Amino acid sequence: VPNEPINWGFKRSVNHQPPDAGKQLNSLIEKYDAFYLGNTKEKTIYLTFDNGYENGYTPKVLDVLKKHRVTGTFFVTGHFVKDQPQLIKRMSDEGHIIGNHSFHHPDLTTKTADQIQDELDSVNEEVYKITGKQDNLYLRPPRGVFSEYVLKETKRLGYQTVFWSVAFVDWKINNQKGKKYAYDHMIKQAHPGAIYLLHTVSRDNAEALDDAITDLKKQGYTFKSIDDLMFEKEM
Template sequence: MRKIIFSLISLSCIIVAFSPSFSAYGWGYKRTNDHQVPEIGMYQDLLDQYGGYYHDDSGEKTLYLTFDNGFEAGYTDGILDILDENEVPATFFVTGHYVKSAPELIQRMVSDGHLIGNHSYTHADFTALTQSGFKEDLLLFERALQSVTNYDRTQYIRPPKGIFNAQTLEWANELGYIHMFWSLAFVDWHEDNVSGWESAYNQVMDQLHPGAIILLHTVSEDNADMLEHFIKDCIDQGYTFKSLDDLVFRDQVMDPLVD
């Protein structure tokens, strides 16, 4: 079998951490710059089996903005302003620490109509948890979120550092969660690594493709500065920004057997 070189976003290689019966994987893909959806190799079978997503396979020129938030660096308010001004929906995958430390921003995300995703309470490696520990971590996050908003519960989950396996995918399904990975990202989570907004812009535009689920971090000044340029240029190229709910609802309508 030919090797696929994965362009890992959160890790530099596939992590193999052996448990009694499951290996742990770090999300990754074969990066492209020809407007094509990147390949994910063996991960595709896992997503098919457990109903996870990493892109929109309709072929339409739709984009889905997602942000991972573990701590606040002072840029999220400005990012929310840009999203509001351009009427672009987003999903914010946040941790329990973020909910506790930045409740006003969480409340604004919800009031602005954005989705909140479960990024765990403790930013734990899901594959190192027992099933009861996994459930408790996610439910702690839900309780924290409910304590500062009227959000019923989250539907989408993104594992910290992209670490997962078949067992954690199954456990999440049993709790009613849908895994949302990504098909476009770059190393943008180092708060002190500022290269200028053009660098961030170019790295995103070079990977752009129809149906991309885009992962960004709000700790990056470069991301905050490039976001408006990126949104406007994508719209000029005929792209439409949609919510993850649009993607999932469309698939459920097309497959009425889905509960």
């Protein structure tokens, strides 16, 4: 299979309609069971987070999710796990899902099968040492970079690759825009079956999320987890 680097990207959602990555990308991901949307036939949103390091707001994000009784899926890197053991424990104890964002967050298309296996297993290994548990195998390619080779290999390793349908610039520490910026994006880009990709390092992201969930729920949206997505898609 080809190993041509591919960066996950797509035209943003418009008019609250699910976005589409195109026929070529849709065919590729489906050939390997990867997905970027959940059930678009109901007003449901699946929250996911990418965690590479901590900037002091994840505890508040966890409090907000608990308050709204929403289950998040956090894709963590080796560094995050090693640096924030207590947070990993909270995610596990509070019913959240811990996804794999690789240990060193490298470009997987440049790693051999053996290297890929180690990059992923090492994260689970450390997570288990902390939680004594292990979630279903979910992966989010570092920097959204992948290829058919990466999808084929990770799937062979039992990993389900999870992309996204909503994301914005909430990861730039040198330019933290505030609550309104993030909130407005989560409301405007909302759509049935949306899988949100959020970060927890920018100023007021927890407060923006709190407001977004509150208002999205009022609109008639229900928040489900990646595990729920997988389960319901099976039945």
